[PDB]
Write a protein that binds this ligand. Structure first.
Ligand SMILES: *[C@@H]1O[C@H](CO)[C@@H](O[C@@H]2O[C@H](CO)[C@@H](O)[C@H](O)[C@H]2NC(C)=O)[C@H](O)[C@H]1NC(C)=O
Ligand SMILES: *[C@@H]1O[C@H](CO)[C@@H](O[C@@H]2O[C@H](CO)[C@@H](O)[C@H](O)[C@H]2NC(C)=O)[C@H](O)[C@H]1NC(C)=O
Ligand SMILES: *[C@@H]1O[C@H](CO)[C@@H](O[C@@H]2O[C@H](CO)[C@@H](O)[C@H](O)[C@H]2NC(C)=O)[C@H](O)[C@H]1NC(C)=O
Ligand code: NAG
Lengths: 486, 486, 486, 486
């Protein structure tokens, strides 16, 4: 009944990709991006933008979707959504390309933002928040954000249902999906979530006093012991929301012919998770991961080994990768070693790649925006706990960068490992944001930087190409203004 | 068996959308660009470009293709092709989109150039040239170009046959399809083709001494009578090709389960056609038309009415639209009123729109490159024999552009006529070129721009935004250089 | 669109040839072999052989094919395939002969083995397995063998679709087409198929306990009931295949403009079929058949009456012909009356010839290899359930032979029933097997051998002619080695 | 209207294939035999043989025919004639293989013997004699042999016209075409013909006293001058014909829509040509040849330079190749250096292969029967004036053989020169003779007989394979008795 995949993929899809205990994680590096076919539509109107891609790689199919903001790129503006389910396919020449069996376009009045999608046996499942108001008004709204549920089936038809926000979220002021891909666990699909908590509610006094700190590396926070505790605490209550607690949430909805059956929220204790934020839930073989965005003071990409028992989820000590960082505010940037209360950053997810014999994780792959402050210079690299492998530049100079979601799959019949980072980059004319399906293969560092590098750089015309701007580097300044987030 | 269309589109597809004798031509007009899902793939590759698009609209379905060069944008260079078939559907809100049902992506060792495609009952029929050598090299090859005739089934599987060139094209040095595709007439499909002839052959001796001169409205050439003839003659033997005679053609193949069954080559007298160049065969109502790109002296768009009998065709003097002009090299430019030997211009196709009570053609639609010299500033307006209506600018400033293909259909249920224009635009990052399906509706001028006019301009970052360059206007020099062509 | 046949043949093909309840079956006999123009190519290489023919006769055309080993005659080795489609034609003198209208010779890199063909409304459909490995290697290969469905269209062109085995054959370790061809029925083509099953697979569990014993006429096995059952049961798991069950299978594809569309795999109960082997799917008048080779304990020829309902055929207790035998290894040879586990014999099909008044089958014709043990002495003859007619020998003495596939038809104009056997015969120089189409007319014994009898024997030089060898009759020993096989 | 060929050959048919004044003639040698698809029919009847192949290759098509005896191999026996025309094609992988485009098999009461065939502009033009009587009975028949003009057209049908022999042949007792085909020149065809002459008739009294002595090589003839002159003369009155003069003659008919129009008989002087016999007419490029069979005392092959003026041909002093010999009766064998009155030999023709800059012949190709006395050991080799290159053996040991006609062509695209030898070889079962399309590629001797030889030999089973015969070499006797001719 399900589309499944092509002959060559089955067996290498959604499983531990690389296990070697003799080799080093950094010995694995990405090749130059490979030519394939685009399943991601391109902007027609030169007015509004399109951003926020979501991807989940099933053993069977794949699910992807993004949001289209009709006019202006502003968060709250009236928006559409394009969801697409598909299947890997290999051409007559045996080249790799993603294929879309069924897509959908929602043009209606109702709004959807931070739609996350996961792959489940029944179809494409996505959890969207319905926004009739803006960010500020919603935190001012004691009524949980109207949330819904939908499934794109292999039949192509789309059926939706509106979950009960009041009951589920009664302790929540605002509720949004973690924007990232979820995954299918024990016959119920799980999505990450984040949001603010009502003052003095059952769930708020629950995380009260709870906090945690994770250091970066060799260099350690120069602040005193009792000083590290304070900043870590108030982080959960940023000024943006005026002393509201943003908690990390995890939603578990059973996958059944009945849409939205037995919704169950699972909140990890704050002695584990940092300030609530958007992210992605991953399952590699028997392993389960919850990816948290760097919205907090901590730059290095985080993967929380997670488990599920009795409809509820457990979170353990997060996997950190130091070379893999993200841009953010002044208090919280790629170089920040201390705790603080701030709002900045961006979504870039590592997808588990390299593993040990005991099956524990060691190093991964990611498409990172390489920079300290503004969101810039997309770069693809393979990571371990400490540093990252040789990289591949999306373009020379620096180019406008945004949310990136990476996924790695294996081709059994060719015995070759592939990774697809779905990325947002400056679209210039046509609305400033065009998401691209980049394709790459992991290689082995053993051999004879052969003097021919197509991964060295790539050509961006938006900075260069007539006038050389002006070289006193208010350009850096004008660039850092050129970067728009949230 | 066939997909047909939505119940909405049936009845308004491929016909005369507007017939009024009491309406002035320029009094209709395009809308601002409408929002729709893009059915056209975007470059993954950060190396080569994506060029030479083609389109046809069947009473049932649509057929489209575009060629992808793997290294650089050069004409001869090795390239994959991408073809697809799709339908016209209406979403839940009644919105207008074009869905691709089945697409094929050609990765093989065969290098296909200038591919013409038509929508046919049995599927998508495509005429392509496989090219072993470069342009000059093949005009040095007394051997006619090698070609193919394929069809993409509704079943998704794509078949191809190599048609016999040595027999059929025998008098030709080189033979190329006309890009934008011919159409389905009388249980056989007809494609546009141009190319070089074997000097003093059967055909070369046929078009010898034959010519025709086409003047411009209200503007007459100051040159002497004999002179004009002397030129116009030499128009068919341009310098680039060395005394050889460049000829126009249309190819008729009988649509059948077998591919390429019974090829018949229709060669018109030059007493009618200008220097052979690329084009399109269009069918609207009972009306057949053949577009010729303006690749020699005559700028105004040319629609040659066409009759069909005995597997061959016959041409009659073209419908001249003096409102519709293309850029070109200095000798033949949007302005030029005299005959001149030259090779320049671009493919911009007029689509028949308004007709009289006697069934003759009145006005047409299209996107034109607005400029005298090079390819720049695409625009979409309505035209009659002389002037042109209020336009819709695809960009403010001026940006690099290319071939554009316009097509107009009617939505019967809502009784709303729409126009699709597929244009190529400088893509900067990702290979300099991208093929966009622009959307436009036909509206009535009668009324009161409201002092809003969002259709006026569209932003472009290519040229401006860090520097503005050097107003010294050597800018226009490099902007002219930013144009890439054949 | 069809080529059909010559008007003299029309009405005699694919029907019941003889109905007399009054005449004795064995009163009908083959003439002496007839002179006709041979449509089956003969070897060029003085190295590899050419073996394994398959033939099916449409009411319009015919379809024949054979594999060719490029070097050596060994099964696994690289093999071309020649497929032809042709027609019955009558010369000026009315002399019957077979004509090839179009042909395709597949020399490519894909290995096609055990190829079956069938005459269908669209052309020549055929079903081949492509083999990467030796049979040995593939019964260990948990993966089912790749198969392809090609068709040669009257247009002369040839197209392939490799059907997707992982899903269709999923319960099979290896899978092969039944050599001798299938027939076109109910707007879908049906093929003979065999292979091994995965232990404890849905199919395997389905056949567990299932078996049948077929007994020889007038000769009954002395072995006690228990024993026979045990032996019989073992027949399905010969030790050559290592205790995997060897299963007979029928394959149906719906013949359509799309090759290999909507396959359905019909696995009969072993409560009926014997051990899996090659075969032929026959259609005679309103009746249908499945020929099964004698590859296990049961010597006589087998036709299974086959009813077709719901794309899945059904089978019934088989017609047997007790004097139509096949050579076999000691446990299972011409004379074998008991059940035993073995793999032997040769493909020689009966073609239903004579019928009763109720349309049931009464007797058949065909070419049998006449000897108890090895492959030797081809003889053509008419058979009934019990014994056989006056015969005709392809040669005096005893010649190495192989598969035979016979087909009988009637020329109504003259009212003369004829029969074609395509036979595998030793070729001496040129590769040891030459596939030849012998031709014969059927006759009523009522009449007067006139003391002429040119049908008695034919001269073979491969045994005699400079020496006569050594009468010690170790000749027999060597002669039995002159036979090669599978 | 002709079929032409596949585009890859054009320009490689009927021209000087090899011109190097630097290379040694014997440095060009044949390949091992090549795998291809056999276009010549294979025997069905196990009684009568199939003999006497003729061939001519025009740049458009080819023409081949052969005779089929019904019972026994005896010349005069009633026999069918097969004629077919075809077109060189290359496969998917570019393999050379011939194809029969059209064929007719003549079963009528007429007998066509010693049939020659020439590919012309209008089709396959063949010339046969219709034989009522035996060879004896005919040369005692004062009346000239009835002959005929057939043609096989592209439309597929075949017409025939009997030319007036009484008027044309008046001076002859008997007349037959030269077997191997002649070729078309200047809007009229030319055939090889030999036969007898009425005593004291104009043609006979002309050739009286005219004779030619051709000396082999460094081995000369010791007999004195008168003894030689006298035998050289006797050479034209062999006993077989009883003092009737055997003459060589060339037949020229006009090639038109009306068969038999304007026949002309050119008879060259005996001061040039040896005793008359079967032969071939070869137009290679700008030159013309005639191959006289070795039917007389001259062992080496013979190519007479042949010029044409006034519809009547003319010959010149012949090209001798001493290496390329033929077997015959005792007085005239491979080794005969002197003149003699005898009748033997066989048709094995040289095909012009290597040339000089002045367009004079240097060496040829051919398949020769290598032996002094009887017809045995087919071998392919490249010859020059004196010696021969490395050779290809159609088999090991000594296999019964017969006429060989051969022609060489080039494949332009791949630029490779091939050669086709059509040759008669012992068939054992199924008729004692089989005509086979033997294929080869010519090679450069430059290189290193690499220690891997498949051309070394080939395997025949008719001498060997049980009993080793008996070694006293009455075997050579029984062998030389296993060869039958004429
Ligand atoms: C699986 O094996 C790996 C390799 O030994 C373990 O990795 C070590 O973990 C310890 C404990 O944290 C560290 O002190 C070492 O630095 C790690 N070594 C390396 C090379 O990474 C890992 O702990 C094991 N996993 C489990 C669950 O036992
Ligand atoms: C169809 O109607 C149109 C519009 O009246 C005709 O076009 C006119 O043709 C006449 C005669 O050649 C010209 O004098 C006018 O200048 C044309 N008018 C325009 C606006 O182009 C056309 O002739 C009619 N078709 C036929 C075949 O009679
Ligand atoms: C079809 O006809 C055949 C021949 O008449 C029938 O076969 C006979 O069946 C009867 C009844 O069992 C037996 O007594 C005879 O021995 C059979 N004859 C032969 C030659 O086998 C057959 O029964 C008929 N089919 C049906 C369904 O009745
Ligand atoms: C097969 O036949 C049965 C009985 O008519 C019918 O119910 C069923 O629908 C058929 N199967 C298919 C797939 O059409």
């Amino acid at each position: 009944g399900a589309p499944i995949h092509d002959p060559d993929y089955i067996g290498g899809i959604g499983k531990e990709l690389i296990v070697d205990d003799a080799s080093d994680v950094t010995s694995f590096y990405p090749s130059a991006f490979q030519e394939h076919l685009n399943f991601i539509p391109a902007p027609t109107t030169g007015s509004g933008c399109t951003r926020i891609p979501s991807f989940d790689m099933s053993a069977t199919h794949y699910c992807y979707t993004h949001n289209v903001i009709l006019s202006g790129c502003r968060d709250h503006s009236h928006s559409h959504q394009y969801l697409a389910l598909g299947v890997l396919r290999t051409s007559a020449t045996g080249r790799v390309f993603f294929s879309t069996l069924h897509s959908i376009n929602l043009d209606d009045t109702q709004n959807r933002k931070s739609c996350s999608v996961s792959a489940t046996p029944l179809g494409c499942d996505m959890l969207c928040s319905k926004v009739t108001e803006t960010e500020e008004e919603d935190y001012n709204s004691a009524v949980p954000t109207s949330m819904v549920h939908g499934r794109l089936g292999f039949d192509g038809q789309y059926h939706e249902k509106d979950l009960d926000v009041t009951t589920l979220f009664e302790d929540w002021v605002a509720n949004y999906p973690g924007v990232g891909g979820g995954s299918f666990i024990d016959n119920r699909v799980w999505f990450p979530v984040y949001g603010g908590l009502k003052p003095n509610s059952p769930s708020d006094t629950a995380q009260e006093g709870k906090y945690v700190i994770y250091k970066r590396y060799n260099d350690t926070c120069p602040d005193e012991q009792d000083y590290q505790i304070r900043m870590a605490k108030s982080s959960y209550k940023p000024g943006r929301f005026g002393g509201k607690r943003v908690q990390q949430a995890i939603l578990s909805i059973k996958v059944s012919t009945s849409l939205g059956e037995d919704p169950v929220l699972t909140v990890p204790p704050n002695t584990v998770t940092l300030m609530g934020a958007e992210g992605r839930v991953l399952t590699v073989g028997t392993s389960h991961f919850l990816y948290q965005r760097g919205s907090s003071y901590f730059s290095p990409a985080l993967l929380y080994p997670m488990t599920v028992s009795n409809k509820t989820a457990t979170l353990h000590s997060p996997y950190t990768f130091d070379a893999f960082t993200r841009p953010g505010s002044v208090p919280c940037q790629a170089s920040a070693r201390c705790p603080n209360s701030c709002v900045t950053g961006v979504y870039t997810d590592p997808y588990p790649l390299v593993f040990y014999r005991n099956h524990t994780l060691r190093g991964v792959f990611g498409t990172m925006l390489d920079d300290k402050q503004a969101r810039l210079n997309p770069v693809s690299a393979v990571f371990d706990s400490i540093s990252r492998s040789r990289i591949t530049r999306v373009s020379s100079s620096s180019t406008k960068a945004a949310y990136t979601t990476s996924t790695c799959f294996k081709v059994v019949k060719t015995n070759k490992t592939y990774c697809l980072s779905i990325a947002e980059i400056s679209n210039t004319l046509f609305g400033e944001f065009r998401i691209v399906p980049l394709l790459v293969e992991i290689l082995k560092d053993d051999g004879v930087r052969l003097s021919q590098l197509r991964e060295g750089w790539k050509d961006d015309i938006v900075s260069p190409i007539f006038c050389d701007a002006k070289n006193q580097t208010e350009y850096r300044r004008e660039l850092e203004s050129y970067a728009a987030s949230w």
